[PDB]
Amino acid sequence: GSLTEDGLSYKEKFVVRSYEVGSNKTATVETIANLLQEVGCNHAQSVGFSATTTTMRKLHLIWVTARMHIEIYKYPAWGDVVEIETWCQSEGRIGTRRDWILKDSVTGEVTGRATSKWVMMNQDTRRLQKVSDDVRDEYLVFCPQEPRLAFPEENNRSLKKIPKLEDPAQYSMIGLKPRRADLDMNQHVNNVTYIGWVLESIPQEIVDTHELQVITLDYRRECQQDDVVDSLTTTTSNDSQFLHLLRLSGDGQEINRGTTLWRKK
Amino acid sequence: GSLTEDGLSYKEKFVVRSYEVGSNKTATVETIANLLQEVGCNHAQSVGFATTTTMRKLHLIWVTARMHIEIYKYPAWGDVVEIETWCQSEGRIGTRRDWILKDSVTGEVTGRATSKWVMMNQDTRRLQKVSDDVRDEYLVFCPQEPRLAFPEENNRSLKKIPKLEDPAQYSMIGLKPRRADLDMNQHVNNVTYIGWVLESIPQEIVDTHELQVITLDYRRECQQDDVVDSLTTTTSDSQFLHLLRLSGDGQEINRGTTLWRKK
Ligand SMILES: Nc1ccc(F)cc1C(=O)O
Numbered sequence A: 001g002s003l004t005e006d007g008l009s010y011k012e013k014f015v016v017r018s019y020e021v022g023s024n025k026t027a028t029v030e031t032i033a034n035l036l037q038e039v040g041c042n043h044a045q046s047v048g049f050s051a052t053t054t055t056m057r058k059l060h061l062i063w064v065t066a067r068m069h070i071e072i073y074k075y076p077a078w079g080d081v082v083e084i085e086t087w088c089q090s091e092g093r094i095g096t097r098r099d100w101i102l103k104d105s106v107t108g109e110v111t112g113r114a115t116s117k118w119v120m121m122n123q124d125t126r127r128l129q130k131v132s133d134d135v136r137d138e139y140l141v142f143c144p145q146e147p148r149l150a151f152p153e154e155n156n157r158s159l160k161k162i163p164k165l166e167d168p169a170q171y172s173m174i175g176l177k178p179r180r181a182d183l184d185m186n187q188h189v190n191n192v193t194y195i196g197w198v199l200e201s202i203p204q205e206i207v208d209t210h211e212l213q214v215i216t217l218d219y220r221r222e223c224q225q226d227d228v229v230d231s232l233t234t235t236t237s238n239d240s241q242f243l244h245l246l247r248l249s250g251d252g253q254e255i256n257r258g259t260t261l262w263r264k265k
Numbered sequence B: 001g002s003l004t005e006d007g008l009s010y011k012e013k014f015v016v017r018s019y020e021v022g023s024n025k026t027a028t029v030e031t032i033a034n035l036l037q038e039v040g041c042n043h044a045q046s047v048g049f050a051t052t053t054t055m056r057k058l059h060l061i062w063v064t065a066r067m068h069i070e071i072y073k074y075p076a077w078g079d080v081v082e083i084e085t086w087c088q089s090e091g092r093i094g095t096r097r098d099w100i101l102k103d104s105v106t107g108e109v110t111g112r113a114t115s116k117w118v119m120m121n122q123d124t125r126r127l128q129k130v131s132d133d134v135r136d137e138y139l140v141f142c143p144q145e146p147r148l149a150f151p152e153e154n155n156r157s158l159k160k161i162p163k164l165e166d167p168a169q170y171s172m173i174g175l176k177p178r179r180a181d182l183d184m185n186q187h188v189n190n191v192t193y194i195g196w197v198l199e200s201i202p203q204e205i206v207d208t209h210e211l212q213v214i215t216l217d218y219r220r221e222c223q224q225d226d227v228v229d230s231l232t233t234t235t236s237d238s239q240f241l242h243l244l245r246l247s248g249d250g251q252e253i254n255r256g257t258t259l260w261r262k263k
């Protein structure tokens, strides 16, 4: 892939692999979310980050995901080439945003889009803090200065408040544990794995009759390597909608909440 | 990727992705096993099929009996790896797929893999192997003279693997596949079992050693709604004996051996 002409965004093409497709013979939202994070990483490599700056590294500060929002119009087939464009933007002192457009290489049509909110956190104390002027400046030079939004709509689903699922849940999947393959290079659970855990409580019948269009996921707390998760789902609704909760099987400490929206095949 | 000049093998290049790397910023053996599989499918697509077909008239499928991988160096994140794969007939016993992994820049051999496949009914199992009439169809796509990723007469890839006896030195219990672990036909993909075997390796071995060899026998499939126990015992370089069995009745799904070199 490559930065575009103006060096304010980055583009990469992926051929969908045999093991990346699910029950519809098209790419899983989990495969998609992995490609988003792959292109995100190549963008950061391309402008000399490692997504820490010099200042962040000095202060032991990291970016962490607060929210991910994916909307898929068409999942690419096995052997299809998908093109992904990604860019970042400062949201003043609150944090940063990374956005994504997925396109069919042949038709040039938008088959998906995604957006995500990052907040700055001390690596060691795990304490959140607003973005400091020095940090704001260092990456303002790699971002469009006029607003560029994957989700521009006046009241767009990407920014809606998600409520807490009350017990009892309609559906549950109990005793979920990450294996080593769920870990990134720094021994942290991959953000994508939590997508897998949320969807594990979706009943088979929905998987058989519907396709996932939208997923919104808040990240509250990270699941450690030796934590166990419970995944909870309740129907909230031609379109089916669900409310989602991931919590630790013991004390019921919340790690995630979400909504998914499915349309009849 | 493409069939080589002679149409008797297939070649493809992969850029190692960020999420594909483990604890030492090099590709997991699970990423690798997924690449061997992808290149296998692309080879099958190219010669007109990863399920060799027109035999399916009688509802028969190829099924993995044994996977054997040896890695000399795991590619780093951003590296380009070239994989070449071919298939061979072992008479009426079954069928062999072999792989060579190269560093794209140096042309150096960084790994090799081999696997035994057998014919199964599918609606029934009954592993009835054999061919005669079925072989001709897919023998025009294979080298006629033997071509072996592991040619050395009496090599690791053909060793008899014994059954771990209780109690295990190490165990990881209550392993369950998720939807991400299923192929398009809702079967657990054979790479997941590699993951479940390595889950019972102690952290301290992961910290000090690198996996060099893995041999895995596939006895029975794990269903979507089965639960697995992974058992490991040190048999010594460090060596391990491995057993996957169903949590409940302790029905064997897999056995294997791993060999690790000091870092
Ligand atoms: N994870 C998945 C992988 C394939 C698929 F068809 C469905 C799902 C799901 O979670 O509903």
Ligand SMILES: Nc1ccc(F)cc1C(=O)O
Pocket: A180, A181, B021, B022, B023, B024, B028, B030, B195, B198, B199, B201, B206
């Ligand atoms: N699955 C793994 C991923 C990374 C790693 F460094 C080790 C393992 C293992 O199984 O021992």
